[PDB]
Design a protein around this nucleic acid. Sequence first.
RNA 1: GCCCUCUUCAUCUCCAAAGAGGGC
Length: 457
Amino acid sequence: SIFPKISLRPEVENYLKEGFMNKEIVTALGKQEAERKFETLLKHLSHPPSFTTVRVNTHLASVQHVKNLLLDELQKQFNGLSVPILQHPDLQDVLLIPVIGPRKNIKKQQCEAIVGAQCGNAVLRGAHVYAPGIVSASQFMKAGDVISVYSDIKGKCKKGAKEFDGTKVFLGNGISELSRKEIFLKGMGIRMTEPVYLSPSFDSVLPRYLFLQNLPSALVSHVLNPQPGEKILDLCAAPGGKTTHIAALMHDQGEVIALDKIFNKVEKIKQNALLLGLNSIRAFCFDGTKAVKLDMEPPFLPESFDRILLDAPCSGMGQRPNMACTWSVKEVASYQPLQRKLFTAAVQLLKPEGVLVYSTCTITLAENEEQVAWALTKFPCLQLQPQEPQIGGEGMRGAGLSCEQLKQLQRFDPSAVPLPDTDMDSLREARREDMLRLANKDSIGFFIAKFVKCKST
RNA sequence: GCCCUCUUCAUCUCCAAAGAGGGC
Ligand SMILES: Nc1ncnc2c1ncn2[C@@H]1O[C@H](C[C@@H](N)CC[C@H](N)C(=O)O)[C@@H](O)[C@H]1O
């Protein structure tokens, strides 16, 4: 609608096309209908999801208790403006907050600010512009003036640049907390008083009760279905959104092991675990590809966990909003070998009759369905299983999988439904039945696979 | 000032990158 397609290098944009126009997909659909769904996908990755999704930490407060407190917070932020807060009927701990946008009649100001590409995404998701996110502002920008915020999506603007002619995209207007001289540090930089997409700010709303998580990511731990008193492993876990979710589903009864290769990233897990009141979590900085111990705290012996979650590192191109990804084709393909190494460690560490859930935050066939076919061939002890709840679409063709196997996977296609232009007259002219499905389809690009280990090794 | 590479950290919701070297 409002934003152009995701700016991809000519090499990577065709690398995705080659996978989305494979012989398996263009035979089921049409050759003209296969490219239409691919170019529609490229147009949707630039836009934010039409819903804000929050996960209630049920170990410290109720869904009924946090929803009421969120209504109190939403009226303060929106100044009487009442946007509903739905509750997902399939995910008991997730609340849905519809996005108001895109607004297209916003008058642009002469005072400007450029922010980082990732900071620009958070603005489109309801965040304000804090101090370390501004990359450039107008020369002598007065503290307290209404300012036009733009996202440096190519990430090419140097810090403190007086001007910037490169590709920038309008994010809305707001009044600034600080001056340009004071910027070029923490605190509030630019309070978004008129964003293109309207959604609540969740910076420090209810740190012990909430966790802002995408719907397909909160669905992951539900699909994993941990049980109280089980030994669960989160191989790639930081910052621990799913790890804390798994601990909450077990009522903190059991053992949840969390790993990640970066020291500070692991510290975030420990803070989030303590902040949300989970004591069953134990986080370690460790290479998951080396987490298997043998004859001669990680590493662990094989067949040691009841369930294992591999939210593997990926190309991350199933992210929304994503208006520019300047990666190489080699950097996008950089994740396939590392995924297969982490997968091999999980299969060995999983107990017999254990459950393994594999998930990515990208859209590529080589990282989602091709890995499932590779796993079920290299690991005869594994067997694909149906998922509960089933929220996303079927698996994508091109990996030579069954129709019964594709029906068992959950791939979230942002191309599934058209982008809505939600103003406040639209919700008052809509039913709760339609918005629940829109939240299940207008999601980020995501993939979920679930296996079970038949025999031992 | 404009344009390029390269090294890592990074967007999987909210304090959001900073180095190296080239061309005009
Ligand atoms: N060899 C490794 N061992 C452990 N963790 C890794 C390894 N390589 C990458 N990672 C982590 O894997 C994560 C990739 C993410 N997709 C997982 C994030 C996490 N599931 C979340 O809820 O946000 C990153 O945080 C990486 O730091």
